[PDB]
């Protein structure tokens, strides 16, 4: 006696978990923001009521397509540039040892040798000062990529510097964001909104410390797959940044040399002045109080009475064993032993000074037999950035001990575009629904 | 009580909200459903939205719905698809839910209003003969 | 999330106009209706009326008609009180007050602003 | 208007205590009355809607029963932060209006 029939209904609030190809929005640089729409000046947030959603950052979508999407973005860019297969020579090197201190022993190479002109039947005799870690010996040396691939020099008009950049989905698709605070990227979120994109999310590059990153609104907070397995990668996010000064203070000389038609080599021709290795400083007091933050936080995930140790990278490329990034166009590698190194056991204006080697040649993911020149920058260097969180790696495990040790980990960029996309996922949206009615065509 | 009319809460903010409810809302979901490295990220997925769309709109036109947003079918309701009342449906569980439980239903009653739309034409065409 | 944001403290002499600016974060600024209350040194809540922001339409109380008047932007998320004719009866803290507004009803104010606090005096 | 009348206005108690404070209009109304907190010199909180149903976050000590014109509201357990001014508000017709005010004092 119920006599109920179909009904249809189009424009039902209800979608499902999707993967799709989300497009660039944003406000020379080797982000490419030509190509992207413009954002709009009010972008329009739906504050979602009742709305409880599964979310799960270590799954993500969004993270492959925007790695996808930056190496993309850094390998268009390099294209247009010089390719200096030339520069594959006999290198005649000689120790840089004018006006250097006892830290810039041998960390400088002044290299002379042939190259090719713009005419073919022409040959000129220049030199440039490359890095130790640039060349290596065969007093005759070679580019350290010489027997994997010829490297691609970067244009000089192009900018490396982060610009914000927002993942806004295609029609029929929505982009769902978690306003929950304290939420630790896995499991239901009851706190839900629509967003037509995200906030700007700068690509930085860096390993070991999150820069110029978002901070947590309400205390520090620790992230991992499986916190119980070690070999999954920590991640911390701050809610207090740390200000870390880092500078290049060799007032370097960029040279030109004429390599072929059209094409130009940018040599380092001399160090003005005295030569001294480039650093960061951290503060020590802002450090101290965020580590214990941090140790504070991973109590609660293993042991109020545990002790907790920070201490040097395991081992590996220079990559990930070090705090690697770029600061104006230089390529920093800095020894962060001066940060993780302490142990924490449950109960003024000097500053960490963390030294750093510059490198020209570099890799920027991993990709083998794929290499890049910078070249090198006119002039003093510095450059101010937040330390906003850190990719640790637990050590160990057994229970044998009841000390947990946490190192700087890295390499992977994936991580950190993960920790910025946590809040994030898309979704598609199933207008179609049929549901019982009384009423009868 | 007192009230100044409907109030408008977005493109999804009626997910939350019980069928009856979000029944109101249908034309705000139904409207935004077609509106080197990252120009060619828009014309695939635009391509996308323009097939997703087109088929929504031909599953429903081969039905007899077409241009409609509430459609009453000739289908009868087989309960074994779901045995909950109307009273509990309606007022006390929203549209997610609803997709969750009857996710397994979908293609055969889709195709019982195909063949029920057909049917329906050609007894119209009967008809109009005479 | 969900907050009212009024402008600064206001002092008018009387006879003055005093504008009232309420924005509104983390819910939809058309979603819900805002009633604009009043209380006074001391004294209890005054309802002074309500407007919805989606339609533009408004109510005022009957002893407030052709003298308190009500807009929005939804541009910018925001709601204004336009109160004219300013009296020393006037002082008070205004508020700005989100309605729950469940069925297309009045349900009950959950979330309020910060108040404002109008002075008028010689 | 529609007057709202309150019953005590100032009453004094202990933690740990009962309170039960009395809403009496002089016209009926259904359901349509909210209950509401207010501190000195702070803005009003939601504490009751539909006579019978907290607001979110609200301690679940509080509760509230009524029809008509006769409504209750009743603080089960006393709590230090519970002493402030208490409201009771109509909205079947305009314009809504708010109660005398009900102190509640320690002892």
């Known amino acids: 006696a119920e006599n109920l029939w179909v009904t249809v209904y189009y424009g039902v609030p209800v979608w499902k978990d999707a993967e799709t190809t989300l497009f660039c929005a944003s406000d020379h640089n080797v982000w490419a923001t030509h190509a992207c729409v413009p954002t709009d000046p009010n972008p329009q947030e739906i504050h979602l009521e009742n709305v409880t959603e599964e979310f799960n950052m270590w799954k993500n979508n969004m993270v492959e397509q925007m790695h996808t999407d930056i190496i993309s973005l850094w390998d268009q860019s390099l294209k247009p540039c010089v390719k200096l297969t030339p520069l594959c020579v006999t290198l005649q090197c000689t120790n840089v040892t004018n006006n250097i201190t006892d830290d810039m022993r041998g960390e400088l190479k002044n290299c002379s040798f042939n190259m090719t002109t713009e005419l073919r039947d022409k040959k000129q005799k220049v030199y440039s000062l490359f890095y130790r870690l640039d060349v290596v010996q065969i007093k005759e040396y070679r580019l350290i990529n010489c027997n994997t691939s010829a490297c691609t020099q970067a244009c000089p008009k192009v900018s490396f510097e982060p610009i914000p950049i927002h993942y806004c989905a295609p029609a029929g698709f929505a982009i769902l964001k978690c306003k929950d605070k304290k939420f630790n990227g896995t499991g239901p979120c009851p706190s839900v909104s629509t967003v037509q994109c995200t906030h700007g999310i700068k690509p930085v590059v860096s390993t070991q410390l999150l820069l110029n990153g978002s901070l947590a609104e309400e205390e520090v907070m620790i992230r991992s797959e499986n916190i119980t397995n070690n070999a999954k990668n920590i991640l911390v996010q701050f809610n207090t940044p740390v200000q870390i000064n880092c500078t290049r203070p060799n007032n370097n000389t960029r040279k030109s040399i004429r390599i072929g038609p059209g094409q130009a080599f940018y040599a380092t021709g001399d160090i003005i002045g005295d030569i001294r290795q480039a650093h960061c400083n951290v503060s020590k007091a802002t450090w101290n109080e965020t580590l214990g933050k941090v140790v504070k936080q991973l109590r609660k995930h293993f042991g109020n009475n545990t002790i907790i140790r920070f201490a040097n990278s395991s081992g590996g490329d220079l990559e990930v064993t070090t705090h690697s990034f770029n600061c104006g166009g230089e390529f920093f590698y800095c020894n962060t032993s001066g940060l993780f190194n302490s142990t924490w056991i449950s109960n003024s204006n000097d500053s960490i000074t963390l030294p750093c080697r510059i490198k020209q040649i570099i890799n920027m993911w991993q990709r083998i037999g794929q290499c890049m020149y910078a070249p090198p920058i006119q002039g003093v260097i510095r450059c101010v950035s937040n330390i906003t969180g850190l990719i640790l790696t637990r050590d160990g495990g057994s229970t044998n001990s009841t000390t947990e040790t946490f190192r700087p980990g890295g390499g992977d960029m994936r991580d950190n575009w993960r920790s910025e996309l946590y809040k994030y996922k898309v979704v598609k949206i199933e207008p179609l629904g049929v549901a019982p009615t009384r009423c009868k065509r | 009580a007192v009230g100044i009319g409907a109030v408008f809460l977005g493109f999804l903010g009626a997910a939350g909200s019980t069928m009856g409810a979000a029944s109101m809302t249908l034309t705000v979901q139904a409207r935004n459903l077609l509106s080197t490295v990252w120009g060619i990220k828009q014309l695939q997925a635009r391509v996308l939205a323009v097939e997703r769309y087109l088929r929504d709109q031909q599953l429903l036109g081969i039905w007899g719905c077409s241009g409609k947003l509430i459609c009453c079918t000739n289908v009868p309701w087989n309960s074994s698809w779901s045995n909950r009342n109307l009273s509990e449906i309606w007022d006390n569980m929203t549209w997610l839910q609803w997709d969750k439980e009857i996710s397994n239903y979908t293609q055969i009653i889709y195709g019982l209003l195909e063949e029920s739309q057909n049917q329906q034409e050609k007894n119209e065409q009967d008809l109009l003969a005479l | 999330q969900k907050v009212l944001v009024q402008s600064g403290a206001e002092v008018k002499k009387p006879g003055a106009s005093v504008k009232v600016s309420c924005r509104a974060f983390?819910?939809?600024?058309?979603?819900?209706?805002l009633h604009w209350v009043r209380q006074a040194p001391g004294q209890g809540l005054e309802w002074l009326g309500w407007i919805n922001p989606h339609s533009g339409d408004t109510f005022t109380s009957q002893k407030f008609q052709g003298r308190v008047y009500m807009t929005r932007d939804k541009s910018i998320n925001t709601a204004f009180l336009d109160v004219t004719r300013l009296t020393s009866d006037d002082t008070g803290i205004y508020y700005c007050?989100?309605?729950?507004?469940?069925?297309?009803?009045?349900?009950?104010?959950?979330?309020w602003g910060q108040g404002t606090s109008v002075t008028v005096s010689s | 208007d529609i007057q709202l009348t309150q019953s005590p206005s100032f009453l004094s108690a202990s933690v740990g205590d009962k309170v039960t404070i009395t809403c009496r209009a002089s016209?009926?109304?259904?359901?349509?009355l909210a209950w509401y907190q207010q501190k000195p010199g702070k803005a009003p909180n939601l504490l009751i809607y539909?006579?019978?149903t907290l607001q979110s976050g609200v301690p679940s000590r509080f509760s509230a029963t009524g029809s008509g014109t006769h409504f209750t509201l009743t603080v089960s357990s006393l709590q230090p932060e519970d002493f402030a001014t208490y409201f009771c508000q109509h909205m079947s017709s305009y314009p809504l209006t708010f109660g005398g005010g009900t102190k509640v004092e320690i002892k």
């Open positions: 007050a989100r309605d729950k507004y469940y069925g297309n009803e009045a349900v009950g104010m959950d979330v």
């Open positions: 016209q009926g109304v259904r359901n349509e």
């Open positions: 983390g819910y939809t600024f058309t979603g819900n209706p």
């Open positions: 539909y006579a019978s």
